[PDB]
Write a protein that binds this ligand. Structure first.
Ligand code: HEM
Ligand SMILES: *[C@@H]1O[C@H](CO)[C@@H](O[C@@H]2O[C@H](CO)[C@@H](O[C@H]3O[C@H](CO)[C@@H](O)[C@H](O)[C@@H]3O)[C@H](O)[C@H]2NC(C)=O)[C@H](O)[C@H]1NC(C)=O
Ligand SMILES: *[C@@H]1O[C@H](CO)[C@@H](O[C@@H]2O[C@H](CO)[C@@H](O[C@H]3O[C@H](CO)[C@@H](O)[C@H](O)[C@@H]3O)[C@H](O)[C@H]2NC(C)=O)[C@H](O)[C@H]1NC(C)=O
Ligand SMILES: *[C@@H]1O[C@H](CO)[C@@H](O[C@@H]2O[C@H](CO)[C@@H](O)[C@H](O)[C@H]2NC(C)=O)[C@H](O)[C@H]1NC(C)=O
Ligand SMILES: *[C@@H]1O[C@H](CO)[C@@H](O[C@@H]2O[C@H](CO)[C@@H](O)[C@H](O)[C@H]2NC(C)=O)[C@H](O)[C@H]1NC(C)=O
Ligand SMILES: [Ca+2]
Length: 595
């Protein structure tokens, strides 16, 4: 047997089934199988899980059981010998703006979220894990190798908690452990509106019947809206500066404040929903609040889908784009729209695209003040630099005029993320995102590198010289061999990111395959995909193809000069045009005449 039975904690509701609007949870998209792609369900498995005991224990848990005959190397040791570098000179992508990196984190947050297990509010396990590095239950510490400088200064390990799973979150036992995806699988702007009934309602402004989203009432950006502050204390955003005491923002996704440019992107989208809702009220005075909200919501989701598939994916996938993603042929109800477990690691290629600094530029795109350029690590869960230091326009300009970091085999992840990451639950700027990614691969039961190469129909190197040829790098292959002792054991996150990039793309062959297949499925398996006949009218679709991120900036900021193609590297002032030259979204096709 299969067992489609286990479904426990899910947010089930009844399907209206003629509603022209998506549900908040993702349910009812697929008519024959209503829960397909919904939030709070297990991530799909394209291949069986690989755990140390076949059921739930990650490889590396029992420093006594090997993987294919060899001990798996420490997550942090692989990070130190392969992922790190010191020199930031020459590391920038010459043909990708900072926005290229930032849009990827937005798309990713719309699609997947596998939360850490809790079982702890007034818990000492969150201390037994952090304080003593005792592995057990959901605590699976990242231990430091001999000679790691963090040993001298931080402790014996980095605390790490296992990801939540379906059927309980208590102990449990029976079938293999499947992690949860707490957001909707469809590209539907759930990062703005929420994936839950609760949260979505709370984000809305129901005092007025205008279909607007709630906005901050304590601060304004030159009369432009800020997201509302989050209710919860202790707040990570005020701990980083107890003097400013500025809390984190409240948005449709819980990671909105992880870094300043992510919060900036979230603010733009919140502003766009409100802009849309009042423009729709101008054209249709009779529409009620709910209708304004849903209609504004539907348009914004179409915008994310368009920017993502027309502008972003072609420059990630490059020449592999047509290979995995065919031109759209219509909705396919037999296609599985669920985000796969391996995708959540494949999409983490963006971590190698994050540069070490962030800039605030003034109106002539010149350095904004004395401390214009800031190290990235000072900006994790930092909301005060926005509210107290200039608003979002200076940050938006930097997104347009600065570059992303280029993935480089000798320089993979910046130290701002590799040694100085700040985690919401803890107090130090001392975590390692690369080590966490590797440890999480094991936590999630990921098959190894060659298993995924096979899945994609690519060769599977078994020797040093095999890897060399595939990676087209002798030194990298050798370092990987000395740590893993067999390409079969290489964790998918580093194996996939170590491959040279495809022509015109920014990921290698393995990743192009994993990414490409996933994106083909959420497009083809989405009943509300924007091009699906009947979702929008021919005239509405005609108006929607003229959207651009440039216009979004023009309409929701006080920036007047923007580039036409925001994802490629743009130099000021030559590549910048005046906002009034940029195509506007024409909303007259939405006008609704009575008689
Ligand atoms: C800080 C972090 C970023 C920027 C400075 C950053 C950036 C990205 C980009 C550009 C991505 C894709 C193009 C991307 C993907 C995914 N991330 Fe990552 N990210 C930062 C920090 C984190 C942290 C912390 C996590 C959680 C790690 C854990 O396993 O505990 C993280 C995750 C992910 C993730 C998987 C999300 C999920 O499904 O649970 C991506 C797909 N990022 N980030
Ligand atoms: C830096 O990156 C740029 C963006 O990837 C790249 O320019 C792009 O090259 C494509 C090639 O396909 C050109 O595209 C378009 O071709 C027809 C127009 O005849 C259109 O119908 C299609 O939509 C297709 O996209 C563009 O000229 C260009 N795309 C954009 C958006 O600018 C640069 O060439 C790169 N620069 C270098 C030196 O590598
Ligand atoms: C914690 O947040 C504080 C802001 O809420 C921040 O202090 C602010 O930063 C600088 C001083 O370093 C000041 O900015 C400018 O103010 C006047 C003009 O009004 C100039 O003459 C100064 O020279 C300075 O350039 C702010 O006034 C200051 N605000 C206050 C109330 O002190 C702290 O730097 C943050 N601390 C940390 C550790 O991040
Ligand atoms: C919900 O919407 C109302 C109405 O648009 C907002 O109230 C307006 O707020 C602006 C700015 O504070 C003021 O100039 C007006 O006094 C208000 N206009 C009206 C007609 O009441 C209200 O702030 C919104 N609430 C939230 C939490 O976002
Ligand atoms: C819609 O997608 C489904 C599921 O991916 C496809 O179904 C395939 O049907 C062909 C028969 O033409 C078989 O070769 C396969 O066994 C199915 N493939 C898989 C991987 O399940 C199909 O391509 C699409 N269906 C239509 C009618 O367009
Ligand atoms: Ca979603």
């Amino acid at each position: 047997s299969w067992e489609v039975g286990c479904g426990a904690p899910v947010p089930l509701v009844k399907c209206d089934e003629n509603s022209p609007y998506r549900t908040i949870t993702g349910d009812c998209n697929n008519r024959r199988s209503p829960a397909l792609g919904a939030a709070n369900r297990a991530l799909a498995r394209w291949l069986p899980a690989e755990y140390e005991d076949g059921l739930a224990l990650p490889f590396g848990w029992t420093q006594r059981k090997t993987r294919n005959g060899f001990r798996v190397p420490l997550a942090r040791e692989v990070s130190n010998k392969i992922v790190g570098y010191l020199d930031e000179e020459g590391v920038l992508d010459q043909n990708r703006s900072l926005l290229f990196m930032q849009w990827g984190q937005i798309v990713d947050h719309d699609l997947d979220f596998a939360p850490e297990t809790e079982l702890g509010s007034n818990e000492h396990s969150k201390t037994q894990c952090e304080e003593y590095c005792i592995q057990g239950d959901n605590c699976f510490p990242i231990m430091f190798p001999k000679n790691d400088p963090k040993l001298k200064t931080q402790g014996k390990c980095m605390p790490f908690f296992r990801a939540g799973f379906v059927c309980p979150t208590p102990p449990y036992q029976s079938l293999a452990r499947e992690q949860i995806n707490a957001v909707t699988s469809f590209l539907d702007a759930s990062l703005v509106y929420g994936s839950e009934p609760s949260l979505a309602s709370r984000l809305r402004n129901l005092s007025s019947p205008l279909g607007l989203m709630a906005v901050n009432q304590e601060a304004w950006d030159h009369g432009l809206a800020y997201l509302p502050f989050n209710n919860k204390k202790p707040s990570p955003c005020e701990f980083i500066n107890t003097t400013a005491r500025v809390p984190c923002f409240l948005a449709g996704d819980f990671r909105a404040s992880e870094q300043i440019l992510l919060a900036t992107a979230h603010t733009l989208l919140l502003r766009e929903h409100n802009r849309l809702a009042r423009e729709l009220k101008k054209l249709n005075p009779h529409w009620n609040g709910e209708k304004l909200y849903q209609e504004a919501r539907k348009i914004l989701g179409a915008f994310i889908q368009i920017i993502t598939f027309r502008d972003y994916l072609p420059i990630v996938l490059g020449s592999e784009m047509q290979k995995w993603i065919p031109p759209y042929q219509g909705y396919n109800n037999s296609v599985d729209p669920r985000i796969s477990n391996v995708f959540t690691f494949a999409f983490r290629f963006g971590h190698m695209e994050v540069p070490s600094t962030v800039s605030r530029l003034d109106e002539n795109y010149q350095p904004w003040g004395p401390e214009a350029e800031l190290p990235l690590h000072t900006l994790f869960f930092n909301t005060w630099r926005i509210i107290k230091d200039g608003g979002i326009d200076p940050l938006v300009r930097g997104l347009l005029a600065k570059k992303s970091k280029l993935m480089n085999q000798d320089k993979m992840v910046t130290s701002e993320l590799r040694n100085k990451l700040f985690q919401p639950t803890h107090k130090i700027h001392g975590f390692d995102l690369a080590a966490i990614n590797l440890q999480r691969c094991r936590d999630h039961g990921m098959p190894g590198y060659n298993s995924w190469r096979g899945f994609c129909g690519l060769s599977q190197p078994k020797t040093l010289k095999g890897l060399q040829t595939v990676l087209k790098n002798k030194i990298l292959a050798k370092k990987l061999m000395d740590l893993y002792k067999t390409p079969d054991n290489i964790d998918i996150w580093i194996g996939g990111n170590a491959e040279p990039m495809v022509e015109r793309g920014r990921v290698g062959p393995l990743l192009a395959c994993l990414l490409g297949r996933q994106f083909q499925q959420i497009r083809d398996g989405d009943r509300f995909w924007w091009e699906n006949p009947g979702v929008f009218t021919e005239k509405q679709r005609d108006s929607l193809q003229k959207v651009s991120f440039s216009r979004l900036i023009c309409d929701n900021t006080h920036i007047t000069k923007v580039p036409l193609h925001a994802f490629q590297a743009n130099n000021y002032p030559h590549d910048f045009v005046d906002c009034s030259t940029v195509d506007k979204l024409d909303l007259s096709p939405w006008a609704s005449r009575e008689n």
